[PDB]
Amino acid sequence: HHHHHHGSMQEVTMWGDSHGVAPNQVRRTLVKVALSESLPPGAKQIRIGFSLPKETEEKVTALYLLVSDSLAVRDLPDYKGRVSYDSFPISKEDRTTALSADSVAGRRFFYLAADIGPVASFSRSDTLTARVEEVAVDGRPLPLKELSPASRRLYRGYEALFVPGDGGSRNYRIPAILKTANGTLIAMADRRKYNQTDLPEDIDIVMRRSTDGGKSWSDPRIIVQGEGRNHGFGDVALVQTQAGKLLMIFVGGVGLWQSTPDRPQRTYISESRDEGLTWSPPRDITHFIFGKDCADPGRSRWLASFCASGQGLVLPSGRITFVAAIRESGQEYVLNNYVLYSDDEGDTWQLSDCAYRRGDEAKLSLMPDGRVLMSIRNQGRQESRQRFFALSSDDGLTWERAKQFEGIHDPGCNGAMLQVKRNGRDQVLHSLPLGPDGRRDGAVYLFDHVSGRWSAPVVVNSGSSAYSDMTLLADGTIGYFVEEGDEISLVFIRFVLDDLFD
């Protein structure tokens, strides 16, 4: 029938790759090919024919056939040897290649990979592609099931900073990026050691640093170690204060909806005075926000609070701010937003007036005229499934809803904003998944302050895409730090605005 009964039906499945790439990167997958079964014992060779346009050929320095017993999602070097593979060189002018079945040694997964040269142009049109045209065993072709085209966009930088398996952690989630005044880059993450689930699972906070603008990164270091279920840590947000100290804020303990006034999920801060090399022991500041030890009786029966992961905002006055999403009642799964802020470099903390009813993870950015813009995640598919916005003209103390900023879809995800100037026009860059209604196709949009209108989205990384954080580098490049894949890797991408929009 569909399944015949005259022998073993070998089936070949073939995926083109669409992850970003950057110049001078080695062994980047263009196409992956999987056999459903091992080559049979009587088989002597497998031959793979492929096409590759001249514009791609002009941008690579070498080609390879990689053979592995594992089927990997990312480029094989991204797994740092945790995926063992053999590498068989191909001349860049060649369009076929063959391997003995002994060389293949029972393995089923084949990768057409390339070394990328020192490319000069990064426009939207500059993408690498290849196609596998033939797979034959003992000179007999097999039917190829093609499941996606190859299209790898060239970016000025592109690096997976945290990949499932790294350091023994099974998974990673929740990206936070910070550029300090001296130019250092701090990237932090949930080290989701056993699986991808949120607190109250056992989770660590891990960090990597770069002192050359993201060209190279230090070995990952665990900053805060989880100590078991209900005793992990995660959801980091970062700022640098006016005095120059770095500050991280994070939660730990039970899950968000399990937190109670008397047994809370706690909020901690830790600071660094040396550009992220060393960090102070985490200090519990839960008592400034809610619960049993809170000095405000009106908030002592609040149940939960957490600041949105990524970055806060330090205002021109030196006021340090993070938006907290707070659970006020145990009868409902509903959060309200309040700005958590300090006017004494983190010694004490206060709460603004309520900024958003039925909000979720929220971010802040500084308007050109000095007002503060809040972007609030739409949780629970409220209203028109749009992202929510609010404005404050008193440095974050009081707020009004700002529907004139609404206009982009939010499938219910954390994202980030940057205030940017383009062609003399003040604008806000906003990162979110495009969806629709799913965490797919990581996108950026530009909102024009003066016309009150949003651009069409530009997809930065197609495929599964979730939380993102953004920072401006000293030289005008943008650093974009996104959750890629269903099993997430945290990826740091660098571009200028013209690379995406004009």
Ligand X SMILES: CC(=O)N[C@H]1[C@H]([C@H](O)[C@H](O)CO)O[C@@](O)(C(=O)O)C[C@@H]1O
Closer residue to ligand X in complex, CB, 183/438: 438
Q: Measuring CA to CA, which residue among 146, 210, 296, 114 is closest to residue 471?
A: 210
**Least distance between ligand X and beta carbon 379 (Å):** 5
Annotated ligand binding at 464? The verdict is: yes
Q: Residue 53: what residue type?
A: P
Q: Which residues contact 284 (CB under 8 A, 6 or more apart)?
A: 266, 267, 268
**Least distance between ligand X and beta carbon 479 (Å):** 21
Q: What is the C-alpha separation between 65 and 17, in angstroms, rounded?
A: 15
Closer residue to ligand X in complex, CB, 251/303: 251
Q: What is the C-alpha separation between 369 and 450, in angstroms, rounded?
A: 12
> Cα 2 vs. chain centroid, distance in angstroms?
41
Q: Residue 141: what residue type?
A: P
Q: What is the C-alpha separation between 419 and 407, in angstroms, rounded?
A: 17
> Cα 426 vs. chain centroid, distance in angstroms?
26
Name the β-bridge partners of 35.
12
Closer residue to ligand X in complex, CB, 104/174: 174
Tell me which residue has tokens 């084949």: 110
**Nearest to ligand X by Cβ — which residue?**
256
**Least distance between ligand X and beta carbon 197 (Å):** 9
Containing 103, the helix (H) or strand (E) segment is helix 101-104
Annotated ligand binding at 82? The verdict is: no
3-class secondary-structure state, position 181: coil
Q: What is the C-alpha separation between 77 and 6, in angstroms, rounded?
A: 41
Q: Which residues contact 140 (CB under 8 A, 6 or more apart)?
A: none
**Least distance between ligand X and beta carbon 374 (Å):** 15
Closer residue to ligand X in complex, CB, 132/174: 174
Q: Measuring CA to CA, which residue among 129, 142, 117 is closest to residue 36?
A: 142
Closer residue to ligand X in complex, CB, 290/306: 306
What does the buried/exposed string (b/e) look like for 446-474 if buried means 16 or more CB atoms within 10 Å of the residue's CB?
A: bbebeeeebbebbbbbbbbbbbbbbbebe
**Least distance between ligand X and beta carbon 481 (Å):** 15
Binding site for ligand X (CB under 6 A): 174, 198-199, 235, 251, 256, 306, 360-361, 379
**Least distance between ligand X and beta carbon 381 (Å):** 12
Closer residue to ligand X in complex, CB, 264/457: 264
3-class secondary-structure state, position 79: helix
**Least distance between ligand X and beta carbon 342 (Å):** 21
**Least distance between ligand X and beta carbon 205 (Å):** 12
Name the β-bridge partners of 446.
429
> Cα 318 vs. chain centroid, distance in angstroms?
29
Closer residue to ligand X in complex, CB, 165/411: 411
Closer residue to ligand X in complex, CB, 128/251: 251
- Residues comprising the binding site for beta-D-galactose? 440, 464, 486
Residue ranges at the known binding site? 440, 464, 486
